[PDB]
Design a protein around this nucleic acid. Structure first.
Lengths: 122, 209, 114, 56, 120
RNA sequence: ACACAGGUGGUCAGGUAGAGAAUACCAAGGCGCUUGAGAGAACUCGGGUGAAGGAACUAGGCAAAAUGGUGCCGUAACUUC
RNA sequence: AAUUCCUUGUCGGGUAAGUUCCGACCUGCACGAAUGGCGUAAUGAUGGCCAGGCUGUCUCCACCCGAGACUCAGUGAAAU
RNA sequence: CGAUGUCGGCUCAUCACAUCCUGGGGCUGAAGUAGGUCCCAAGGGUAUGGCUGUUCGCCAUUUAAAGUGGUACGCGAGCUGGGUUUAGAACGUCGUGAGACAGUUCGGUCCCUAUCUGCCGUGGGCGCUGGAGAACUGAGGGGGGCUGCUCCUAGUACGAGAGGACCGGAGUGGACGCAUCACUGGUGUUCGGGUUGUCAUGCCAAUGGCACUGCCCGGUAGCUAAAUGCGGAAGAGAUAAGUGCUGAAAGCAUCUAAGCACGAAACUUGCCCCGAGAUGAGUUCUCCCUGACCCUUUAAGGGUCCUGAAGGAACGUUGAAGACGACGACGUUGAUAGGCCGGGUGUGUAAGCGCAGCGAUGCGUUGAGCUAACCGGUACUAAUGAACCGUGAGGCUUAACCU
């Protein structure tokens, strides 16, 4: 789950829906990414009204996971497939000003601060 | 400094109102008794010896009964020795309980690995297995060539080779003491701990740095 | 026995219902996370029931259209508020791991109760 | 093929002495049957360890 | 390994061992005593001890249980009445197995197994 | 070689599923094949069962798995229609 | 090019990567006019490439069942 | 020349350096940052795919790097069969033809009933000096030899400006190695249900076989990586390169010659684990046989009477242990195994009957029936008394003590 050469979903605003995983990165011999991991992406498909180009390369942060996410002392939540939020190449943070879906409250790290500048559930 | 013996009685998620799940291994101690203090056996050093209830005192034969002939006259099924420091000791038979770990944060535990028989080189040393097509002929579980080619004409020493597995000394020295229950003589330590439920597990304070 | 067959008994909640798999329960929690209370709920159908250990884990499947969402719950956790016992269900199986695909008439599970 | 350079009758003994001649168990005799028998097995007298059932 | 696998092999497959015991498992209920080899006389108890346990008191649909072992309704008409209730005070301890001789085609000890309450 | 799961021309056979002499199962028909008695380690061989991905393997999807029948709908490139 | 060694000649396509494949050039060492030219329908236990499905080959082996191997007893060798 | 298995690729290694990356010190056309350079270092680390039989050479993407060389081109009774190595078909080239290709295409195999030697396991022997075992210490030998990413120190000072190390850990991971099943799922032909065709079944209903676990779906004991937690840290020792004194050689000077103190991922420890067949068999503790006669040849034998000790090989009911030994338990005086009784668990509401429905089937009786390995009771069953091998204080010399 969230391996190289296998497809991913988008949670960033007005630029792509369907994208390709090309690097798992973040250290040494790492695998099977959780929410808050950064992944290297190519835009497998775009649409002409959006802000992005097909075949262009960038990073994204994981926000929806087929392996789910842990936080409370005795309950685990999981979803269908895997989705990520697209990042700016050299200044970091999410590209858009809004995010699709309920996503995660477990992710708050300072590289992705825009996620607490929003309210996806409540 | 001293020690005790006990057995594994459970492995449970204990919970908190603090947002942590806390898995613990549960250990119940034998309430083991002192046999003697061992002084003037190594220069500038001291130790304590301990034993437990034999269950059947007729199982000690002449060559093993001697361990208990220096502890009164009869039986105890096992013998254990632990180091002493910063004082001299006199003993009559007083019990050792879990209360020695009420402020000590980490322990040193001798658990030992499970029995696996021959176990197979393919798992005992993670030795590889590929598909049977376009590959190996009739010998696919063995540790490769154990001999040295040509000039040395001898078996390579310390090479990962065939044998037996299990009942090997596995020790853990960084595990967290979670809770003591003194009236029930019970010890709770964080996460999993190796050893069978029949094994007498040795517990000491940690001296790992 | 000095703690075996007694370890869970003094740490489990006695005031908890028996609800079976295939049942629509509603589960409520305060969250806490080592901080402050917030009353939240989760809805769906129970696909595997509680049994073993102090954790006594059970799984709920959301069964909402166009999506697949699954949440595990451990019964004797101190931040559990209530189980609302919302609507009964009756089925011919002990486990329902197939509701990860089939959420139509296969999930319109009979109430059977009066 | 074959075992080459025939060994001495001393060196030959090493291929006999672990299996020829090995020890054997002495014959049992029961407190109520005087016929010699094997340690687990019934006598030619019709009994094992003299044990009877529902008889005096 | 053969890890915690119960019951002796006694050649070939489970249905062949069942067909071998089918030559004697009805004879033990019919005559209340049978002779065979020492290992076979011990293993012939399997399912037959549970069947005498099943025969101590009457319940529904039980006449068909273990019937694939020996498909004879005469030895089954013996249950709940002429065999079973005679052991209801002890709730167990139905049968005893003892040594009686030896074979000559093989070094097999012969043994006899009987019911502890029978008219002969 | 042989007391050999082998080879050998003609013509004959009831139901049940099926187009069928294919094929599956009863029926007529035929059989224990000239070493015995038992157990269940390494390991060698054949098969079935497996989470999420997936051709990355290799000369080559090798091996393995998927498709599989029949009536009706519908039908690309090409055409000597 | 089944036809150019030097040469992965050379542009563009496909792929993350194309001494393979497709279209094409026109200084073909040594193509080319019945020891024939050039093209091709239909065809292949046909050679080369691409797309798609499906997959325990593989990522990573996890597991189980069957048959030998195994022992005693009758018979019991051989190549060197 | 009384044969020498011939390159690649897979599979498995090892010695050592020329330093690719990490450590420690200097140099610089060394401001900060970065680069260029070699001193101490060969300890530990150091790649997957595309196109090429590789090598030479490129492309793609990572790395903390993608460092180099030797080994009958390491590693074919190890594997495969690309390149080389016969037999087929064709395009071009040379030729009378055999045949040739500093020209190509498409096709095209891998022999062996393991004897001795070597290792390794259990068995057995010999043996640590009349004999048996366990523990304890250990000459010694193994394990271990390490780090990505995120951030503050640092947006300083430095520098038109651009940009802007390391100060030692905080947050979070990992190659590699090991162990475990609470997490989270998988597997579970030894447990349960659903179901297609077919046989045994008089027929109908049932039940059980057959289609290897027929096909579909759950799962205990246990297993397990898709899961989880650990360990290469700190301290210490002694050196090299180096920092300096004391000081020649050289009546001065000098850090090296002798001398004196300091000073590294190298070298030795610490940590962790095994070891006394270590023939140099360590050091303890438990346990036990206390008899003579004749003759002689004596580190020896023959003749005789009274006497049989510690122990060990063996025999069990078997599992959580296991090739077989062993290991844990174990012999009626026993809960070791099976049966028995209940408990836990798993499955999912059986048969028959009553009712409805053209019938298929549903509903109720029914929170049913059935159940393995997990657990507490219970002597119903079972687990030799005897015997086999084995004696009489054990060589030489002596301090000491009693005769």
């Amino acid at each position: 789950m969230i391996q190289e050469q296998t497809m991913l979903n988008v949670a960033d605003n007005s630029g792509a829906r369907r994208v390709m995983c090309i690097k798992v990165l973040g250290g040494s011999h790492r695998r099977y990414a959780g929410v808050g991991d950064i992944i290297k992406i190519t835009i497998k498909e775009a649409i002409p009204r959006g802000k992005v180009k097909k075949g262009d390369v960038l990073k994204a942060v994981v926000v929806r996971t087929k392996k789910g996410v842990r936080r409370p002392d005795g309950s685990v939540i999981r979803f269908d497939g895997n989705a990520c939020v697209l990042l700016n190449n050299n200044s970091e943070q999410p590209i858009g000003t809004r995010i699709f879906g309920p996503v995660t409250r477990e992710l708050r790290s300072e590289k992705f601060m825009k996620i607490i500048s929003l309210a996806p559930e409540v | 400094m001293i020690g005790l013996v006990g057995k594994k009685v459970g492995m449970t998620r204990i919970f908190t109102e603090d947002g942590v799940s806390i898995p613990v291994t549960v250990i119940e101690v034998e309430a083991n008794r002192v046999t003697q203090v061992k002084d003037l056996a190594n220069d500038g050093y001291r130790a304590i010896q301990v034993t437990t209830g034999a269950k059947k005192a007729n199982r000690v034969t002449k060559p093993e009964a001697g361990h208990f002939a220096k502890a009164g006259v009869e039986a105890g099924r096992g013998l254990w020795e632990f180091r002493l420091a910063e004082g001299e000791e006199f003993t009559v038979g007083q019990s050792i309980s879990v209360e020695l770990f009420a402020d000590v944060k980490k322990v040193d535990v001798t658990g030992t690995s499970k029995g696996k028989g021959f176990a197979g080189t393919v798992k005992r040393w993670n030795f590889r297995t590929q598909d049977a097509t376009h590959g190996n002929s009739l010998s696919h579980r063995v540790p490769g060539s154990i001999g040295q080619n040509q000039t040395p004409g001898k078996v390579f020493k310390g090479k990962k080779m065939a044998g037996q597995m299990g009942n090997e000394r596995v020790t853990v020295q960084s595990l967290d003491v979670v809770r003591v229950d003194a009236e029930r003589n019970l010890l709770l330590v964080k996460g999993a701990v190796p050893g069978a439920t029949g094994s007498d597990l040795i517990v000491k304070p940690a001296v790992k740095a | 026995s000095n703690i075996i067959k007694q370890l869970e008994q003094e740490q489990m909640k006695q005031d908890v219902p028996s609800f079976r798999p295939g049942d629509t329960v509603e589960v409520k929690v305060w969250v806490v996370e080592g901080s402050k209370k917030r009353l939240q709920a989760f809805e769906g159908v129970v696909i595997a029931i509680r049994n073993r250990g102090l954790h006594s884990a059970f799984t709920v499947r959301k069964i909402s259209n166009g999506e697949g969402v699954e949440r595990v719950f451990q019964t004797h956790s101190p931040v559990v508020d209530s189980i609302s016992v919302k609507r009964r269900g009756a089925v011919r199986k002990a486990k329902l791991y197939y509701l990860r695909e089939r959420t139509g008439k296969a999930a319109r599970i009979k109430e059977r109760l009066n | 093929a074959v075992q080459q350079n025939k060994p001495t009758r001393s060196k030959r003994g090493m291929r006999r002495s672990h299996d020829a001649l090995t020890a054997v168990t002495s014959l049992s005799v029961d407190k109520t049957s005087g016929e010699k028998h094997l340690r687990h097995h019934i006598t030619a007298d019709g009994y094992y360890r003299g044990r009877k059932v529902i008889a005096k | 390994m053969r890890h915690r696998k119960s019951g002796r092999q006694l050649n070939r497959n489970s249905s062949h061992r069942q067909a071998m015991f089918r030559n004697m498992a009805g004879s033990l209920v019919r005559h209340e005593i049978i002779k065979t080899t020492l290992p076979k006389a011990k293993e012939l108890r399997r399912v037959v001890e549970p069947l005498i346990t099943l025969a101590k008191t009457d319940s529904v649909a039980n006449r068909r249980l273990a019937f694939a072992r020996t498909r004879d309704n005469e030895i089954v008409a013996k249950l709940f009445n002429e065999l079973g209730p005679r052991f209801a005070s002890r709730a167990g301890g139905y049968t005893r197995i003892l040594k009686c001789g030896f074979r000559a085609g093989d070094n097999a000890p012969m043994a006899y197994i009987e019911l502890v309450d029978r008219s002969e």
